[PDB]
Amino acid sequence: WIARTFYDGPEKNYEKTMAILQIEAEKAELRLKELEVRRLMRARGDGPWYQYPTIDKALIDHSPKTTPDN
């Protein structure tokens, strides 16, 4: 009666633990991958992150400058 009224079968806890383990293992893998990706982008600078600004090329004046040799 106690088991019927208050508790649940072993399979429920078993499968819930499987799901929790899957979720947290995926999270750990994603954390390692994030660290590696951050290191690579900061070292190289070829990704969307760590893009430090440079001078805009639309600021340059392309017109004769009173002197042929600029």
Partner: protein, 57 residues
């Protein structure tokens, strides 16, 4: 038979017919570096949320 140019005439911008080829690279520029991959795609929710320590959202 020489006629003196009037005011405002010697300061005009004119055109020249020449056979000299137009230089393709007068600045002697090098090859420009290739730009970044400029990723594009569809946004999906972050996988398992923030994933910051014990937070589940």
């Amino acid at each position: 038979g020489w006629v003196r140019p009037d005011l405002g005439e010697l300061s005009k911008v004119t055109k020249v017919k020449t056979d000299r080829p137009l230089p393709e690279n007068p600045y002697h520029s090098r090859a420009r570096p290739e730009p970044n991959p400029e990723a594009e795609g569809d946004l999906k929710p972050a996988k398992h949320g923030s994933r910051l320590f014990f937070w589940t959202m």
